Amino acid sequence: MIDQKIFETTLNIDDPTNFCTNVEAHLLKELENIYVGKCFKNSFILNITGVIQRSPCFIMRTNNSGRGYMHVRFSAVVSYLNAFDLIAAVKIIKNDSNIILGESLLTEPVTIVIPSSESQNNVAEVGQIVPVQLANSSVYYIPGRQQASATGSIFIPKHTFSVYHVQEELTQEQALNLTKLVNIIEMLLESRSKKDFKQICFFEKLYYTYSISSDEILDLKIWKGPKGKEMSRLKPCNVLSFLYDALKNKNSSLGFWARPPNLLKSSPLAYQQDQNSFNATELPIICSAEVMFVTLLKEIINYLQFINDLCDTFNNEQLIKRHENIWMLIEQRKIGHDF
Amino acid sequence: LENPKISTFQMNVSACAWYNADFDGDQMNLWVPWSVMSRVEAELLCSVR
Ligand SMILES: [Mg+2]
């Protein structure tokens, strides 16, 4: 994602008399020159928001250098990648027998090294831009490096889903906490609404778990879902509306919550029931409203970001055709309407 | 001492009370501070006065 992080450092000043003529400007300059674009304390620094707190310019005591040092506590905009996240663009630069090495394009500088399996070396080639799925805690931020190393898998949308049993209500202050995620989704939506309809539609058709016979997948202003023969007797519920209602405390958030693959991952819709009637292959997890809401909101943000990044990367159809081979490799993994 | 034939450290006889020294063959160490900080405190702190 992208958020704020507070760091503490000690800067060495090689010319204290000059540095102290303007401490704020020199301090910002040195923090930017040292930390911008590097990994430090399990994070990747993007921008220097400011200096929260500093110390006097002490003169170094254990040597005769006459040099100074200053303790700085500063706030920086950083980007921490989560486990099993989903990037949309990577340029594979190295394709050997042992490993595959690519670099992210849209997001911040990231190196993705896919261990080479026998089913991978015969497909991916140098020059292709593909989406990748991450892994658990494999995003080690080795300090001082200009990229976040992470192992990944070529993304094929799954056929499974999770079910969360919530027995505690979503309170008002935790709704205030999730307001930030709701606002992030609103910004992502208003950024997506500018894009051409054809690109978003084709990318959604490619990455939808099933197939649908055209012009039946998207209602941008209302998000009414796909009109496939009314598969479920219960209409999926908008997450944003439910959160705004729980802000005023008119609805209850108890029961079983699930997001089956038939649902559009990028939409704010989801399924709620009072009884466990979801056809999941895995046991539902008993958890509170906080965890379930956080997980669902984070999945929505991740998939909205994925669709936005896919639409940004491929602005022309010629590149789509150039990457059509990956599209069909995705396509053969879809599930038909034999149900 | 710019005479090239002199190899001894020469000092006034009234300074020997500091070092409990005499001139029967005693040897003494001498180093010249080259750093600025070491040079300042030699003159302000450690002067024999
Ligand atoms: Mg003697």
Side-chain angles (χ1 to χ4, degrees), chain B residues 3-4 8 10-13 18-19 21-23 25 29 32-37 40-43 46-49:
Chain B
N3 188 11
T8 46
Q10 294 178 358
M11 56 142 177
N12 203 330
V13 71
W18 282 316
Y19 313 99
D22 58 324
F23 312 130
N29 293 309
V32 186
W34 47 269
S35 178
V36 185
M37 298 209 189
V40 164
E41 86 166 4
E43 166 209 17
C46 307
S47 300
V48 279
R49 63 176 169 262

Side-chain angles (χ1 to χ4, degrees), chain A residues 265-282:
Chain A
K265 285 152 232 82
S266 59
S267 305
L269 86 185
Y271 270 142
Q272 67 214 150
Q273 301 176 350
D274 263 345
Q275 69 285 15
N276 180 31
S277 62
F278 294 110
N279 295 351
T281 44
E282 286 187 3

Side-chain angles (χ1 to χ4, degrees), chain A residues 3 35 39 46 56 75 78 87-88 93 128 134 175 184 194 224-225 229 239 261 264 273 275 306 336:
Chain A
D3 208 1
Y35 289 104
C39 285
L46 261 299
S75 182
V78 306
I87 306 178
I93 317 175
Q128 289 153 355
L134 305 203
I184 288 172
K194 178 299 289 293
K224 285 191 171 183
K229 278 201 179 186
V239 157
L264 176 39
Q273 301 176 350
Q275 69 285 15
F306 181 53

Side-chain angles (χ1 to χ4, degrees), chain A residues 6 173 202 205 272 316:
Chain A
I6 294 173
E173 79 293 338
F202 167 51
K205 270 141 183 315
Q272 67 214 150
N316 66 81

Side-chain angles (χ1 to χ4, degrees), chain B residues 20-27:
Chain B
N20 295 304
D22 58 324
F23 312 130
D24 58 351
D26 299 351
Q27 296 199 80

Side-chain angles (χ1 to χ4, degrees), chain A residues 95-106:
Chain A
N95 193 359
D96 274 354
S97 56
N98 283 327
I99 72 195
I100 306 169
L101 176 280
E103 301 236 316
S104 175
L105 272 92
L106 299 149

